[PDB]
Structure 1
Amino acid sequence: TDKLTSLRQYTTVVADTGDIAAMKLYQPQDATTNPSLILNAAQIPEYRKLIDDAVAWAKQQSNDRAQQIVDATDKLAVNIGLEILKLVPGRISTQVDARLSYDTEASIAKAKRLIKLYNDAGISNDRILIKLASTWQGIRAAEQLEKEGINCNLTLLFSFAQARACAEAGVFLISPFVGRILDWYKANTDKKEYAPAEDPGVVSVSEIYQYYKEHGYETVVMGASFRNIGEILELAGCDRLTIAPTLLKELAESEGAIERKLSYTGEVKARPARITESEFLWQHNQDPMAVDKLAEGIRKFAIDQEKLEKMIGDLL
C-alpha cells in the first residue's frame, strides 16, 4: 500500500485546507484553516451559499456597516468550519484576525467571539482550536484562554523561544512551521538544496518534539507548512502533521512503507524556571529567520483578512 496510509500508522494526519472535497477524499482526523485558506475557499462557487448565510446573519445582528463587515467575515470563517466539522470527526482550527497578534486582550476577546459563534451553532469547545500567532502576546492570550476552557493552536512558530514559551503556557497545540523555514534558508544562505534530514525546518520540528517529550509537556506538536513529501516523511511520528491536498495526493499515490523517524524513549527531565518576557524577546531575536518570518506571516495573514473584508464589503 501507500505512503499516506503508512504515515497514519505513526502520525495523526490533518488536512490543511478550507475545501470540503479534500475532507471527503482523504478523511483526515482534524482540519486547519487560516485567513489565506479562508480567502481562497471563498472563491469556490459552491461556497457562495456560505458567504450569503454569513452576510445575512451579520445584517440580522446589527445595523452598523463596520460591525457587519466584521461579523460577516467572522461568520464566514465559522461557516466554513461548520461545513468541515460535518466531515471530520476531530477538530477544526480557525484563526483570529492577525491584526490582533500583538494585542493580548483583543485576541482573547476575538477568540471568545469565535467560540461563541461555534457554540451558538451547536458546536462545543472540544471540536475547536482557535489559532493565534505565537507572539509573546498571543501566547499570553492562549494561556488565559486555556484556563477558560478554550483550546488553542499556536501558529507561526519558528524560534525555540517561541516553542519553550508555548510549552510553559500549557497551550493545547503548537504548529511549528517547516516549509517557511526552508524558504528562508534558500533565500538567505548559500545552500539552496537540502537532503530531508538536513532540511532546517525538519531539524527545528525534531528538536522541538524532543524537548517537549523529554520534559513531559502535553502540548500536541503539529508540524505545518510543507514544500515536499521529503519533509513530511522525515517527521513521521510527530503527534500530528497538517498537510495541503497537493501533498496528500502525492503521499496517497506513492507506493511503499516508511519508517517512524521521530521518537523519544528516555527519562522525563526536570523543567527549568519559566522563561520571562525579556528572556523570550532576547532569544527570539537571536534567530534572524524567526524574526523575519513571524512578522511576515502576520503581515500576510492580515492582508488576506483585509481582502476578505473588501470582498464582504462589496456584498453589503
Structure 2
Amino acid sequence: TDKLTSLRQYTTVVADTGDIAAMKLYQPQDATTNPSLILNAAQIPEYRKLIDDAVAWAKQQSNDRAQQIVDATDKLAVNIGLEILKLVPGRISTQVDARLSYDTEASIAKAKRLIKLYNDAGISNDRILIKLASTWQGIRAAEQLEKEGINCNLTLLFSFAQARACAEAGVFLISPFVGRILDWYKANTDKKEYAPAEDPGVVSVSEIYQYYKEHGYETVVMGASFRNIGEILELAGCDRLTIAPTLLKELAESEGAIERKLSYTGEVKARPARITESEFLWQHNQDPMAVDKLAEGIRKFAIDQEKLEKMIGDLL
C-alpha cells in the first residue's frame, strides 16, 4: 500500500488548507488555516455563502464601517473553521490578525474574541487552536491564554530560542517550519540541493523534538511548511505533521512502507531556569535565518489580512 497510510502509523496527519474537499478526501484528524489560506478559500465559489453570512452577521453587530470590516473578517475565518469541524474530529487552527504579533494584550483580546465566536456557534475550546506568531509577545499571550483554557498553536517557529520559550510557556502546540528554512538556506548559501536528512528544516524540527521529549515537555510538536515529500518522510514519528493537499496526494500515490525516523527513548532530563526576555532576544538574533523568516512571515500574513479587509470592505 501507500506512504500516507504508512506515515499515519507513526504521526497524526493534519490537513493544511481551508478547503473542505480535502477534508473529505484525506480524512485528517485536525486541520490548519492561516490568513493566506483564508484569503485563498474565500475565492472558492461554494464559500460565497460563508462570506455573505459573515457580512450579514457583521451588519447586525454595528453600523460602523471599520468595525464591520473587522467583524466580517473574523466571522469569515470562524465560518470556514466551522465547516471544517463538521468533517474533522480534532482541532481547527485559526490565526489571529498578524498585525498584532508584537502586542501581547491585543493578541490576548483577539484570541478571546475568536474563541467567543466559536463558543457562540456551539463549539468548545477543546476543538480549537488559536494560532499566534511565536514572537516574545505571542508566546507571552499564549502563556496567559492557556491558563484561561484557550489552547494555542505557536507558528512561524524558526529559532531554538523560540522553541525553548514556547515549551517553557506551556503552550499546547508549536508549528516549527521546515520548508521556509530550506528556502532561506538556498537563497543565502551556495548549497542548493540537500539530502532529506541534511535539509535544515528537517534538522530544526528533529532537534526541537529531541529537546522537548528529553525534558518531558507536553507541547505537541507539529511540523509545518513543506517543499517536498522527502522532508515529510524524514520526520515520520513527529507528533503531528500538517501537510498541504498537493503533498497529501503525492504521499497517497506513492507505494511502499516507510520507517519511523523521530523517536526519543532515554531518561527525562532536568530543565534549566526559564529563558528571560533578554536571553531570548540575544539567542533568537544569533540565528539570521530566524530573524529574517519570523519578521517576513508576519509581514506576509498581515498583507493577506489587509487584502481580506479590502475584499470585505468592497462588499459592505
**TM score, norm. by length of structure 2:** 1.00
List per-residue Cα deviations over 1:175-217 (Å, max 9, x = no partner).
0000000000000000000000000000000000000000000
Q: Deviations over 1:87-136 (max 9, x none)?
A: 00000000000000000000000000000000000000000000000000
- Structure 2 Cα separation of the partners of residues 72 and 126 of structure 1: 24
How far has the Cα of 1:66 moved from its partner? Answer: 0.2
Instruction: Tell me the alpha carbon deviations over residues 28-76 of structure 1, each in whole angstroms, 9 at most, x when there is no partner.
Output: 0000000000000000000000000000000001110000000000000
Tell me the percent identity: 100
2:221 match: secondary structure: strand
Structure 2 spans left out of the alignment, 5+ residues: none
Q: Secondary structure at the match of 1:273?
A: coil
Whole-Å separation in 2 of the counterparts to 1:268 and 1:281: 27
| 1:112-171: CA deviation from partner (whole Å, max 9, x where unpaired) | 000000000000000000000000000000000000000000000000000000000000
Q: State the distance in 2 between where 1:139 and 1:32 align.
A: 19
Q: CA deviation at 1:265?
A: 0.2
DSSP 3-state at the match of 1:162 = helix
Supply the distance in 2 between the matched residues of 1:284 and 1:22 (Cα, whole angstroms): 36
Question: Structure 1: where are the runs of 5+ without partners?
Answer: none
Give the aligned partner of residue 56 of structure 2: 56
CA RMSD of aligned residues (A): 0.2
Structure 2 equivalent of residue 130 of structure 1: 130
> 1:236 deviation in Å?
0.1
Distance in 2 separating the partners of 1:269 and 1:124: 35
Give the superposition deviation at 1:255. 0.1
User: Which secondary structure does the structure 1 equivalent of 2:93 belong to?
Assistant: strand
Name the structure 1 match of 2:300: 300
Q: How many correspondences in the alignment?
A: 316
Q: Within 5 Å, which residues of 2 pair with 1:219-230?
A: 219-230=219-230
Q: Find the aligned partners of 1:87 and 1:62 in 2 and give their Cα distance.
A: 32
SS at match of 1:132: strand
Structure 1 distance, partners of 2:82, 2:63, is 25
